[PDB]
Write an enzyme that holds these catalytic residues in place. Structure first.
Site, PDB file in Angstrom:
ATOM      1  CB  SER C 142      -0.910   0.027   1.238  1.00  0.00           C
ATOM      2  OG  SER C 142      -1.701   1.198   1.292  1.00  0.00           O
ATOM      3  CE1 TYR C 155      -4.382  -1.182   5.812  1.00  0.00           C
ATOM      4  CE2 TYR C 155      -3.054   0.567   4.892  1.00  0.00           C
ATOM      5  CZ  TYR C 155      -3.814  -0.566   4.728  1.00  0.00           C
ATOM      6  OH  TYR C 155      -4.008  -1.076   3.473  1.00  0.00           O
TER       7      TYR C 155
END
Lengths: 259, 275, 275, 259
Positions: C142, C155
């Site tokens: 990501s 995250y």
């Protein structure tokens, strides 16, 4: 005397590299609160720096043990200028193919609770105090947050994760708190010492723990590291700039220039 | 004083950051030789620091000049402990579409000879002295060496190029000389440009920093030039930065970790925690 | 068809990007085993692709489940050529100040067991099969693995952690298995979160992408999920990506090279060149 | 047949890695305009791909020689979808201490005019055509734009500079042109072949030029690389993920798992 009238908090600082930070920090006029597992090594630390260093027995994984450490620091020193999330646990450089099926789940949790979750809580705990004093965080990363073979999958992922912590916290805590990280490596703290200088460390020498202290002193100096936030100073003797066949490029430079 | 009894060679160290570095290093006990294009500005600091600083007028693109400075530093101070290749030329952040075909080739050479080649002769010159004192090289880079919109194609390419210097020089000069880079960001330097590049756009595309700071600096303020001298002193200190070679310090106020809608993500922290 | 006669194992490959990858890989000739939490969504694709896809209901945090999928893929297809650890959990971009002290420890484990540990058991499970076919691992990362504000502390830390997986696994599994990472950016995935984390903020801090796109995507548009499957096929193709291990593909529409005042710097190009 | 109805421009593509790109690109339905120094090797290239490939004799350093190459491409194919600035010149991995005082100035200019200025002009030349077709650029970088010892100071700086080109052009040319870069290394194109597999390339094998072609084909595929801009795919057999004592971590994995 760069850290006169300063206060710093260091986790896992009653031993290893964190202890070297303590001694140095005190030797700079700083005042060091220390959260660690060892009750004895905290007491020995405290008498070593009479009234310049306090130590609170705790478990870095516990958020509460971090809040206490913050509170006690505030108690004795009234402020917190530099938090140094540092307490780390190693995986013996164990390969994935060697992490056993009945141990991987426990091993993951333990290493990740200490290296990543430990760091999170520290910053969480001290957030009020740091915002209050507009100070900084200086994580202890490692060569293993940038390149492989400094540890196994578990260590490498945990130290790559604290790079994310550096970046996300640098963002989220701005403009009131500067977040940074130092990436030490190749330490007097698996791999032979003869292969260390030859194929690993371009600088050719295993540095003492004392020599890893200055980088942290830098980030904790009032108005010397003001533009610094999100910065990652790699501090591993040059593991990420070593050659293919030899670590060092010009070992024979003096007698190439007849110095 | 971290650098008592040390000797630093700063290039482009008569104006801007390079000059703040002189003042800082002298103030930290060190003696400083300076190479710069300006005769006036060099005398200006020669008088200011007395027997602690000497200046040589020349050009950074010229190896002969670089060598002449390195020798001047030896003559006056007896050694070279830290070399700071700093002298740099901006491209007014001029885009590729805006570069004139008749002016582009000339421009390339002008900027690349200072920002990159000038650094190489700075190292080439001072090297024998650096291997002798087992010293350090600390390169001035820029946010333009890591992420874009800090300058046009030419400037960003030059600073990125000097990232490659750090890494190669760190490799090649191991184990005796340490080579690292400092990457300054939110300083209010004018940063000169080449005449080969026209006046066309200097106010209204090269945007002033104060107008845009909320989109550039997480730290939420423009740091004074003196706040940028701390990182270099760190590399200049033998007992503090010993295990640091090939290191890259992003010194840009968080330009690389700024967020999407605004630079800083914690504007509302003291509201949320009560200070 | 690049992947005719190949076999892919995608985790979390019943919804979102992981599911588009299935459709793409089957369409590229490959047969695909899928591990996912949803029994319905797995049947949904089982019927859709016939004898080219099989699905196993389980959890990515469980090694037994991971192993069960790896075996299921062997049973049905006879080998594993590409493993795609994809299943991921978002933290609603919840900041550290906003993480509840009573909910934080629970949250950590939930997210780290899927985003990181889930990947490790994905590799651990399928490894014998991968060394046997001298195959590849292609990790879904990501933009949150490289730069901030793509998620909260948890995250961003997880995705950064899986960057460390790529590098270590690339080292450890040389020369037989290749390990690389694809880092998607401007997809319109909801990205589920943990119940341990409250509903508190899900609309008004986790900002929608269309509102802010001019500050996030240089490419100036939101790419359809199918536009993100191309990079993985590339790694899945034996004769195209052979000399690629430890590779990191930033696949975010230019999130890392966006500019200060806006994402894209060349809005006015066709005005300036005439198209 | 991934590049059907496609047109690509490749500099320095009449030899070396650029030639492998050509052959492959043509073999994909693509149509390749080639700017290079060799008039003979351009003609041999053209008969090899009858009417699918054109070649214009020029000097990549010349902006004009680039504009012509663009014009001729437009002449024969009417469009330009993927520009591949590729033409590069090496420095024999020469160390700074070995670059002689009377040669450094010439050597700098030559290597920088070809590796950096060559790339700039190509993108400058084709800008109208690329904006017109909303296509992409795929620079040829190298392992040497990321880590040392792939070349000398000159090569390393020139290849680190094209990383800046990747990033700045990705920014400046957005949203109409996607800029990217591939970083190939360890090639069948100084260092012994026996030390190459052992201490340099984790993958353990020198890949053929043909095997370096796919990465470029990827970035040139209509709707497979649409989210890609500013991306840097390192393609060097894993030079940046090799260990300290050995390139490969688990050479003996098969008989660690009795496969």
């Amino acid at each position: 005397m760069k850290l006169t009238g300063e206060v710093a908090l260091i986790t896992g600082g009653a031993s290893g590299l964190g202890r070297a930070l303590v001694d140095r920090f005190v030797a700079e006029g700083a005042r060091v609160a220390v959260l660690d597992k060892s009750a004895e090594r905290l007491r020995e630390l405290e008498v070593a720096h009479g009234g310049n260093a306090v130590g609170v027995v705790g478990d870095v994984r516990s958020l509460q043990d971090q809040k206490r450490a913050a509170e006690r620091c505030l108690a004795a020193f009234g402020k917190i200028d530099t938090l140094i999330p540092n307490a780390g646990i190693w995986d013996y450089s164990t390969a994935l193919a060697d992490l056993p099926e009945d141990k991987i789940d426990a091993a993951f949790d333990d290493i990740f609770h200490v290296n990543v979750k430990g760091y999170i809580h520290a910053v969480k705990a001290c957030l009020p105090a740091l915002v209050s004093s507009r100070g900084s965080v200086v994580f202890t990363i490692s060569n293993a947050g940038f390149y492989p073979n400094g540890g196994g999958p578990l260590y490498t992922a945990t130290k790559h994760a604290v790079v994310g912590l550096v970046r996300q916290m640098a963002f989220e805590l701005a403009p009131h708190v500067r977040v940074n990280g130092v990436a030490p490596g190749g330490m007097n703290t698996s791999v032979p010492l003869a292969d260390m200088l030859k194929s690993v460390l371009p600088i050719g020498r295993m540095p003492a723990l004392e020599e890893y202290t200055g980088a942290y002193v830098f980030f904790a100096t009032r108005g010397d590291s003001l533009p610094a936030t999100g910065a990652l100073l790699n501090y591993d003797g040059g593991m990420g700039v070593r050659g293919f066949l030899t670590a060092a490029g010009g070992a024979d430079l003096p007698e190439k220039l007849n110095i």
